[model samples]
Target: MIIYTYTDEAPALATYSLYPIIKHFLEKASIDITTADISLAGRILANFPEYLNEDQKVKDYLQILGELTKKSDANIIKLPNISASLPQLLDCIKELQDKGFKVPNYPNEPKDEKERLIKERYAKILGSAVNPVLREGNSIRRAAGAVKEYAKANPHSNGVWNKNTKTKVCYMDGGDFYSNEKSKIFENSTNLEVEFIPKNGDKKLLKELNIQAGEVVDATFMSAKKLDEFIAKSIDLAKDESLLYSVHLKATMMKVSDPVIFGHFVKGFFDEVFTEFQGELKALGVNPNNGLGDLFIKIENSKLKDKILAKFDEIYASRPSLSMVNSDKGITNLHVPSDVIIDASMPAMLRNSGRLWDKDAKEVEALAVIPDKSYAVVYEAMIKDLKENGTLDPSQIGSVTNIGLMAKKAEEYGSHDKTFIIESDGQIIVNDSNGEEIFRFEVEKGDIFRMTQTKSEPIKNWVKLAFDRAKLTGEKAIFWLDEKRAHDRNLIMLVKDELKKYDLKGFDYEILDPFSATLKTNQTIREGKNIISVTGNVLRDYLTDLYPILELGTSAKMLSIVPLLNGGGMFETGAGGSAPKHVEQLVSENHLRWDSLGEFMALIVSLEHLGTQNAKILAKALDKAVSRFLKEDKSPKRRAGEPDNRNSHFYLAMYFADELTKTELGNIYSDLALNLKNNEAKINDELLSVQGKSVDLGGYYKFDDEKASLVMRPSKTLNDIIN
Candidate 1:
């Protein structure tokens, strides 16, 4: 079975046009193909079964696909899904509400049980809702050789770094999760409860857990005072050094934890504003954790709106100049929770030559505030290395592909159970079923408390994957594990034991901390030697972005394969950048600049995996066809109309058919090739005729299928040829 996920933004719209092409090609294999709508709207619709009519209701495809990932027959092509921020969620809710769906409005601060339930319902749709659920296998990602070659030939602008560049990463010296972390492997099966004893002595159970033996659970928290001091010092440092100040955090993925830290940064940066309007903000139910977007929305009709606006302006003027997300609108990096994702943002800054865009649209040095010291130093290492050596020569530098442990939610991605935001100053205690304390922590109001767990199974599998990948690719491999890190130390034990199962003959492998690994990986790549940097889930997320941006100018072009534990395959098209902008462009100018190169890469692999699973010969031909298509430079252009996604689709169809006709088993697609070749010019002309015009997609979130098809599939000559 082949499944294509119908996701949000430009990728989803592209699918509306491209899926038919994919289906047409795969029909020769008699492949059973279907699509699942896992967009924010779809997620919302799935959750409220009672509100929808039977005809309007849809099953939770994400959950169904997730369950399927653990099964042997699962072959899914997962596209990038929206990790909705607060504003994104609210807008989606409003869109659905307008479309006659009975979805509840997002509640910022729940006033009652009903509102709390509504908030809970909406919360499930926001943030990284798709990844954690469907990622039932470990990640194996890298740039395809064709993509890498193309990038080297047409290198994107790299930020030129100098010895005098003020760009540097800052973190809390102490009282962060790194310094306060504690971990223990459960010796026995345990029933545990997490209780938050507030300052008023109110006993509130945060969550409950059923732990299995040999599972590692860790608990840690960042001190509010420490975070405040770090923010202040970093801001002052940026000010003194004449650098743009940028705060980076993953509030979307690190949902419960990072949001609290982000709130502290917000408050710390605008201390005077928060202090002056504390009462008013509290009354308006404004929590900075929801970010400035929600705060501004809440105050749109408030009496203190003018005062709040004035305070923001005053703070902006007095504080160190901020790194702009959009200089035209004066949108700073701190405007939204998901805007400044550390993995994407830091690498982008480094790629841009140790610089960030300021309010005047000028690129300048920055002080990147990443309060958690755990992995922050890794970015610093890359910056220092780049400064010393130079911007990497993509043509000469070796690739840093990844073997990431993500199966059954390994490492930080699986930390949802162990993560919480404290409402008041309190003590958190974890006890066994026998009432003996297993873990304890002292926390303050608005502090983030997190306890992450990794089961033994994924670690064993992770080690094996690393070995297999190293063996397959013949690349040197490094286990990115820091001995000093509480979690990595335990993983190190698991990794060492797992290594004994494999034959060590002719294999080069070593374990290195993140800092050392970053520096070594850079050096190795510069020396034209590739390394399979095996890492936990978080680093997988980080490095996939880091290397791809440096190597190919964007992570979206990486080939992300999740070899499911149950022998299934989940082919993932990587990051979605400016997807919304792509959608907007399609709406306004009838052109989609959004590249489907990732999809093109993932599709063939999905077919190849299906071939391996079912022993079908036809899938191999399709895979070869796609390889030829990519190698022939048939990818979409970076701009509108000319070789856009639609035009690229035509070229792909032509290349694929032509390639298929040459293979040993040519009879199956020979007719397709002959017919396409016979009317190539007419088909090309018809496809290009629709370019450079305004076309309607019928809608944004929910588009009119027939209208979209008419716009996307404009070539009757090509359609007739295929038919």
Candidate 2:
């Protein structure tokens, strides 16, 4: 089976552009690119390219490959289905083009000047689609050509270490993260190896690995005693073999050393251990962001992240805390990593950058505090000790062994002294010793805009400038006006009296709020429906509560929305298009001529139709209640077929929107309900009702199923009201 190692980042067009290259390479490698649907490859390519540089190269490669694929096999060239592929692709490419670039680039294999400019443009358009480190890593892999080849070579050896040492060290996640592969090429060669296996398997993965009884030593972790034993055994094993015995070292929160200090300690420890064991020492450094726990803390939200970071000023200002706490302590602590790896999944500065909310500057303070000299010491100390001990040739030891995780940070910081930094709480900041806050702001919903102008000293004067920039760039606007409240309002009204400075259309302002006024007027025809006139989203909420109950046997009510025809001109009242046959007929027989008012009706119909399934789920959910009430043995109905088909919910919505749209006009209903107009029902202006409707069963009546459709015979009200 081929391992599909492609990105999960790009949009569809980009992926469309990317698929050609992936297929080209795989085909060149003599692998059948079409074994599994190559659509996944398209998906990976559809998102983000490696970096600005790789994007261009990848794009160029894609154009070439897309043509080649189309000619070679029409099937492969067909449009591949990807989620959000087209829109995302459009946005990404548009952003790149707006930035005045040709296309994104490939990794470090230098591009021509034309390609270089394109890459530069692509970088600006990258936005917050993914982690910056991931972007960089993507580029790196292209130029490096599987730099992990050497890493993948040295697999875990299950060695034998038998000796004694004062301190203990061990590596975990050895196989998955390539720890074993990297450790084989240690700088020093004196450290001993120990493969202590327990009589039983991993208590954690015993059954899975099928590890049975053995010598019963825990070789997994390095204790001081275990290290000693391992050293002796490794020395013995290596005595007959030419390969050097290497020990892995790690620095985690549990180890608790200042980042700068730990660098020195690790270098010194490796030197000392190699001297004693007459073996080499290797480092399997996981970045600080790669926590050694059950869950990986990926900072997804930036704003709340910034708020949490308000505390970091206290942490950085004071000395770094020494004690590590567990979950029982209510909060946990993270340790700073000195020698973090610079690879795809985890990158060195990812713990510091790759965030938008760290404006508090805590990450900057921490990274800035990391003395540069510490890195030199760590490097020199390892080299000196290895040369002196004769564990490794000095030339070979530093040859790729002393790898530094530059992680684009050195370049980013070098280019702009004010670079982004993140804190423990994932707050992002543009740190500048020169204090030039040149970065643009990310506007969010519900944010108090005036607060931004008030708090930012330079921003008050620069707000207009920022708006100008947004208009030119076609990004989501920096300034917004309340378009929903007033009609015929100038789009430039957002600028208030300052409107004419820039040429803009009313449509230039994307509606921050969306609702329909026509629909609002139509639904109030029959009065006593207990109109709530809720301030927030009225339909979204009612559907939210009813979602769980509507998944039962009511598949026919699956369509989700009732169309608003009147608002078709003013608004795009998008609705799901699928519905059940039964619900479709109900709508065809009873649905009113839906105008914009149809949306409100659809929402109610959705709830009402879903009530059928709601009754089923509830009847099943509270079957015990029903059985207790009945005082009889009731076999609870078991739900079958599709467990929770949301289609039923969709149908319910469309039907409701359709019905409500019709009930809107008074005389219109009067014309349809002429027969009922003369009945004592009196159109029930006091109650919510649907009048003048064709009956599916050909009856001139209203049915309330909750009360078992209690019917009235030619009397005052058409139907009974269920409590």
Screening candidate 1 with a backbone cut-off below 3 angstroms (N, C-alpha, C), the clashing residue pairs are 159-351, 159-352, 159-353, 418-451
Which regions of candidate 1 are displaced past 4 Å? 197-204, 575-578, 612-618, 678-698, 719-723
Each model's TM-score? 0.94, 0.19
- Give the range of the ten consecutive residues with the poorest summed lDDT in model 1: 612-621
lDDT of each: 0.80, 0.23
Give a tens-digit lDDT track for model 1, residues 125-176: 7778888888777888988777777877766776677687668999888888
Best by lDDT: 1
In the range 187-239, model 2's lDDT, one tens digit per residue, is: 22121211112234331111111111210001111122222343344334333
**What clash count goes with each model?**
4, 68
Candidate 2 similarity to native, TM-score: 0.19
